[PDB]
Amino acid sequence: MSWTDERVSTLKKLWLDGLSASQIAKQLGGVTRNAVIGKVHRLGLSPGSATVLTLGAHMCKWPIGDPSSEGFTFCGRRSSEGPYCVEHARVAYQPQQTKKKSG
Amino acid sequence: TQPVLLGITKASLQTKSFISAASFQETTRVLTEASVHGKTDTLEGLKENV
Amino acid sequence: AEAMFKSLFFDAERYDLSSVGRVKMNMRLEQDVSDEVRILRKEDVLAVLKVLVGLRDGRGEIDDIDNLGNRRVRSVGELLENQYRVGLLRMERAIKERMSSVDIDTVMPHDLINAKPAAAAVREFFGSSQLSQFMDQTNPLSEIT
Amino acid sequence: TFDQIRISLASPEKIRSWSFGEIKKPETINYRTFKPERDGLFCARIFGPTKDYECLCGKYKRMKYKGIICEKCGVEVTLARVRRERMGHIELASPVAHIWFLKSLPSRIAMMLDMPLKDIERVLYFEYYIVTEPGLTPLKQHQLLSEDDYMRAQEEYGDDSFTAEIGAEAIQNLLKAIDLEKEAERLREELSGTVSDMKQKKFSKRLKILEAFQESGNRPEWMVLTVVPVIPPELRPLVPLDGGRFATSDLNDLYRRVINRNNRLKRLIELRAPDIIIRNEKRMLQESVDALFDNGRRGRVITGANKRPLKSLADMLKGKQGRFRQNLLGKRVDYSGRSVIVVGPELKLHECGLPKKMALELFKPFIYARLDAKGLSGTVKQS
Amino acid sequence: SIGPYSLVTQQPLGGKAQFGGQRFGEMEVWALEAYGAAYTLQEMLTVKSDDVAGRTKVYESIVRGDDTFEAGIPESFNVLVKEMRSLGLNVELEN
Amino acid sequence: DEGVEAVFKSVFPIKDFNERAVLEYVSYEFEEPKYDVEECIQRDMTFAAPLKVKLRLIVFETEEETGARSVKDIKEQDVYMGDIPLMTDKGTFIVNG
């Protein structure tokens, strides 16, 4: 390897335009990976009834099927004050909620 | 208006210079009260010069 | 709310009452129950309320707190025992929390136990404590007084 | 010289003018080499150099020039005394209310705009929602809807002509929208020609606070401070004791916790976290801020290692290190001695016995001056 | 006569362990205020323990042979001003 | 009712409902002091005796509501504990020099 005036110029140019630092020493030839890092550091400058589109407010959102499939829609019924519907609110959330602790 | 009497403890509560009041009394009520009003101490009393 | 009221006064570990306390309560109020129950009995509260209602009208004598009969002395034994009990409780909590991660099957002892989970609690008692103070070893009279 | 000491509220502009740099990293010193950090509490670039006439990184340690600034390092060469007269400021992502003007005996913020102290605590804790700028719809101003149903279900009156805010921003907007001249003129007319049974007891205090805020020149919005200044790195020292074990003051813990909570809130705001987590972060940050000043009004903040409560800035000036008897009034004095006393009948009334050991130490400079003038000695060091 | 000073307050240390200084208590200051003495109490609180800049000036004047001293401002007052500035309060000097 | 055995019999079993494992206490023994008082005063050590307690890891509870565990023989291992300072004949409690 060499450290002539052209070596520092090409190194700075290749560090500025953008390229992997590991391949920088291989493209220059001779210089190792540790040398280029030290140079740059030393020198600096380092089905339902609604699809996924027609989903309005106060509607069911329980998915049916596979999203990566052909037919994937939601229920889309009267499901205000809740994301899911009443028919699925009891199957989604923990049924028979019985939990308590100290406070 | 006729004068009003008050104890020796409260005599320094409403004093003019806040530095003399902040020494003996609580520094919380004296500083917050004098902060909003922006009272300027003239360094007339003996406690301020010390 | 049910568990809170049950653990506040009717819990063994939460509400501890020494045998001396039970015997003192029996002497003050006859109950015929001592050295067997440590938690506050449901019948003791009614007896205390009845005694208070009786003393309110009269025919009763109050108990002074400065009386030497109502004061007990805690030597080094009871204090060190309480400190070791707190340390053992902390060690038990640590062991219960650590025993879930390691597989209990195909295991042995001496590994799921903290090396110094309670030794620091007993070392800090002699080191930093208002009771344990410097020794006044100036003469044979001070060593005994 | 100086006379006519004046104290008043400090605006954010004045705090920024006082500060030199903003601290962003809660790093006191390095573990391998004990030196200041780039943005830590102990920074040379912000609080001047550590050594006298010697910059860091060994570039301008000649001590011949004092106006130069090290390019690679980033700190100028200055005496160590400048490290005690340099302050720093901390930027806050969300406004916080001052603890002194909130939990004091007379509620200063409650005296303004006729607000009860019980209602202000709910808005600061992010429990309820306050309404401002009411339109022709229901839910008039100062409604303070408690349940969330009133904020969502009762909010079915259009997305406009209805503004509701929560937290310190609500108090800040209320203090910024309040007027002084109009309120003073309204209270002046109401005070004259009134039965003066119970309304006077509050009207007098309100008029007094309004007239104080008017002539003093301090706006009412300075109560909710936005930037907190940091004490210089000389009153909270980190001197290493004998044996390699350092010993720092308890003030570093509060600043470190405040910086950590501020950085956590800043990271939360960028990540777009839910409102439940962002609200708790703002609450914790406000608690850290108003506990760093007093630490007694709210719940006590005790360190996990030491069993004693931390001493904040307020508690440091009350009885222990304040100007009561520790530093200002009562202080240690040199050129003094102590010893037991005895009775002497031969001494006169104006004469007292003094041991030769105490007199030789108290009058050392006088003995040096006498030896210099008498001619029996030469150099001061020799004497 | 001259010993190690404090760390943050810049005052003489206390206690007979390492060259302690007899504390000039608050009640002792009232005794000087009772008398007409105003210069003894002024230098005993600023140039002896408080002032760090003018602390060496009095020693140099004593060793040279001229009795004179100058006190500009104690260090405790500066520390208190820096402490109050840390809070929301604005303590600025005038004139 | 007093002593380390008191608290040990108070709460001996460290049981967990998730895995149903318990630790049983049998007894504890005290070993001789490593350093005597005449050398503890000079070396600035701590006069104490190493405490040793025997604990069994075998638990009666097992899976499927069965009876005896798979390991019929108990573990019966000895675990080291932090030493406690002993009392001299004068009652000095020499923890340090």
Add this chain to the structure above:
Amino acid sequence: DRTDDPVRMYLREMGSVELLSREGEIAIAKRIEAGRDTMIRGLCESALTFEAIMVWREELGTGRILLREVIDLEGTYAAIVSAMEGELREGVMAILDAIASEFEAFRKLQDKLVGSRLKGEDLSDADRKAYEGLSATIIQHLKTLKLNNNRIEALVEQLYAINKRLIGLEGRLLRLADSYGISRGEFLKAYFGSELNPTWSEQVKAMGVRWTKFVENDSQSVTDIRSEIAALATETGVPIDDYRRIVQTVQKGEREARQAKKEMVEANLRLVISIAKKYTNRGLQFLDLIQEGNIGLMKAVDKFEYRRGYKFSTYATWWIRQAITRSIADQARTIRIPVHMIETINKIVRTSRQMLHEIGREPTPEELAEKLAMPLEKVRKVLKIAKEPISLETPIGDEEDSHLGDFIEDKNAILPIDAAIQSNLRETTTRVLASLTPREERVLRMRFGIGMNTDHTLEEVGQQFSVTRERIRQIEAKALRKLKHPSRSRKLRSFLD
């Protein structure tokens, strides 16, 4: 009802609104997948994202960012590291060869379309007959790409910037129009329906007869506003073609995805409290640990598929433990300590305890190096870390007074007796420098900064003096010899001793 507890209020708020769901996590994952699918379908448009990303695809052939950077390999491999990712290069090359025709198509037609939209002439089907097929082919080619998340994030960020510019323009229009009393619905719909016509601002004056009082300002603003927006659309933009719907579909998808993520992170909010309870009294408060665990949970909820672990808790516990342990070692230590240093300290402590318990009385640091296979200088430097410095307010005395801050000495302070000695030396040095000649005294005061703040070297003083370099040393030696006499240096000798 007063609490005075932030953590208590937090737990109350999380318990009064959250619940548990076994199969709800499956529905949340399906909703997140549907939102991602809708966002991808809305982002793959023409003249905005295809031509924008095609400038980077044209850079291919060098293997810098065309392959392994713009498209994820783990996804493409499933559809089918040095030894791997070989056929993926040929795959992306064939994909580029197939999309070259799609890029060549519509490239010369986008300019004509934007020009026709700017001029306002009604576009016929003569070009649409081919534009439909071109769009179908390009969308079919883009659907099979399955790019990574960074490229789609950059594209959606650029689209969001364009939408922010558009909404700023619309807000300026609304703030200029509402002074007369015009609504946003009718105004926006008229702007959308009459955007192609250049004289739409003047043609609407006939319908709005009441607008004549402000028509002059309306025109003088809206003509330049429409000119600016048209220039912005024709410079590096695609024609509208109901662009509001295309920009709102991606926004709706992102909103649905964010809502699903928030619901999923709020449902499992109480799971972090059980893990944070184990880590306590380690230098961090309970609320800070809860916040760090919430951060970890929110970071872990982004990546959750139908892998071997079908329970969200099994995958979230690892991230929560990592977030709690990674943050406890940074802030609670009170000093900057790296992660590798603390882990090495923990390993050394564990091995030392094990050796002390199963070998003998105490493990020596000499054998600790061979046991851990580390040098002696490293294992020796690992100890003596000075962790957890003592607080300065700790009461040294048994009572509350006599704190540790009083029993401390200040080393940087200089005693007055030392400063007094310096003045004497500074004065005696001037008196002793009176018998020497002026030349030697001047050269000595120049080389040694007695009365000068800046020091001068030999060459620096020689450049100002007659003697360049050599005789300066001789003069200094002569001056030093003159001062070595006991009669002349009698008083000065006491300073050194």
